[PDB]
Amino acid sequence: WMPAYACQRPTPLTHHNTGLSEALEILAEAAGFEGSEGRLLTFCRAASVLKALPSPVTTLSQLQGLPHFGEHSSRVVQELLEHGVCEEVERVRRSERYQTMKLFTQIFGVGVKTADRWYREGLRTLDDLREQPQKLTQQQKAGLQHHQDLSTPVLRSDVDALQQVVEEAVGQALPGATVTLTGGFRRGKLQGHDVDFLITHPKEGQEAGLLPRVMCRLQDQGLILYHQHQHAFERSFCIFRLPQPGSWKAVRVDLVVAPVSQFPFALLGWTGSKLFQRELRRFSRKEKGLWLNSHGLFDPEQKTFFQAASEEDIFRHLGLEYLPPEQRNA
Ligand SMILES: Nc1ccn([C@@H]2O[C@H](COP(=O)(O)OP(=O)(O)OP(=O)(O)O)[C@@H](O)[C@H]2O)c(=O)n1
Ligand SMILES: [Mn+2]
Numbered sequence: 001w002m003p004a005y006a007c008q009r010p011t012p013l014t015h016h017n018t019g020l021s022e023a024l025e026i027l028a029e030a031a032g033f034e035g036s037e038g039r040l041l042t043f044c045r046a047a048s049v050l051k052a053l054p055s056p057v058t059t060l061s062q063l064q065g066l067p068h069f070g071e072h073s074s075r076v077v078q079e080l081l082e083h084g085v086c087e088e089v090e091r092v093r094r095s096e097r098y099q100t101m102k103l104f105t106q107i108f109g110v111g112v113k114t115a116d117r118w119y120r121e122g123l124r125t126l127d128d129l130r131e132q133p134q135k136l137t138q139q140q141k142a143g144l145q146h147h148q149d150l151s152t153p154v155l156r157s158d159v160d161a162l163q164q165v166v167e168e169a170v171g172q173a174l175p176g177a178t179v180t181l182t183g184g185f186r187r188g189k190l191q192g193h194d195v196d197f198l199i200t201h202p203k204e205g206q207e208a209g210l211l212p213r214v215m216c217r218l219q220d221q222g223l224i225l226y227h228q229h230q231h232a233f234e235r236s237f238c239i240f241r242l243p244q245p246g247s248w249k250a251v252r253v254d255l256v257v258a259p260v261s262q263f264p265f266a267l268l269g270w271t272g273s274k275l276f277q278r279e280l281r282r283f284s285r286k287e288k289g290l291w292l293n294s295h296g297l298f299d300p301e302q303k304t305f306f307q308a309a310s311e312e313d314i315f316r317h318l319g320l321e322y323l324p325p326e327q328r329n330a
């Protein structure tokens with residue numbers, strides 16, 4: 001037996017049902033490409049159930065008594081168990097629509113609505129996009145310029161080198177300022193599509209104007225290929241030029257600044273997983289009547305914000321057993 005919400009159960013990094021969860025996640029992703037948001041969430045939830053199981057699913061009897069495991073997801077697993085392959089999944093994999101939407105949406109700065117628009121307009125390849133530079137934002141141009149490197153999984157060794165240059169720049173700009181690794185790497189992942197950092201300072205307001213100083217420092221060291229600064233939290237969505245022995249690699253890096261009062265909420269929100277956070281927010285609203293986001297936890301009946309010093313505070317306030325980041329891999 002297993003609880004309904006992903007935020008009520010530990011989901012570890014490595015599990016016993018990777019083939020099955022991957023097939024369900026293909027169907028979820030394809031659903032999102034078609035704007036089918038309900039079906040996306042349903043497949044995502046079913047995949048995350050399999051990730052939380054203690055043993056491999058070898059036979060269909062193992063499905064018994066699991067939440068969020070409807071007829072469709074059951075059917076998928078059934079064909080995988082009996083036939084080694086699911087027809088619907090293979091047809092999605094082979095389809096030009098899926099392949100092209102995956103190609104485009106992978107690009108830095110391209111979401112589903114942009115990818116779909118380009119698909120509808122007859123664009124198929126990365127060369128097709130480069131032939132129409134008037135259709136691209138400067139962010140997307142940068143994403144295309146570095147697409148091979150940005151398609152290469154980011155490694156822990158890369159994270160460690162990046163955290164060192166970001167920590168050095170932050171420390172030189174403002175002694176006492178801190179850098180915290182968030183995103184998937186905080187959850188224990190060995191690889192990622194980017195590196196996520198959250199920056200703050202223990203005195204509220206001392207973080208003002210810190211990010212542009214950090215970026216100047218990084219730029220003057222040759223480490224920045226692309227930067228877009230947005231005054232929501234202050235953030236810079238970047239492409240770093242990471243030196244490596246004999247060469248270099250472009251790597252996506254998100255730098256987020258939060259005032260220390262909001263840091264616990266920001267750390268929780270940015271640590272993920274995306275599904276875990278969606279589930280945590282749904283749980284907070286539906287079960288506790290509170291609205292959770294990356295800035296705070298709001299009681300809409302009382303018009304009050306919860307004061308939290310830590311993630312542990314937020315879990316406790318919501319009536320949830322604490323899950324460390326490595327158990328949030330929903
Ligand atoms: N503009 C954004 C981008 C991301 N996030 C959140 O930040 C976390 C990290 O996002 P991302 O790097 O996409 O996820 P990872 O789990 O780090 O995945 P990967 O290993 O692919 O980088 C997630 O909880 C996501 O919901 C957010 O709140 N606002
Ligand atoms: Mn990430």
Ligand SMILES: [Mn+2]
Binds near residue numbers: 183194195196
């Ligand atoms: Mn990110």
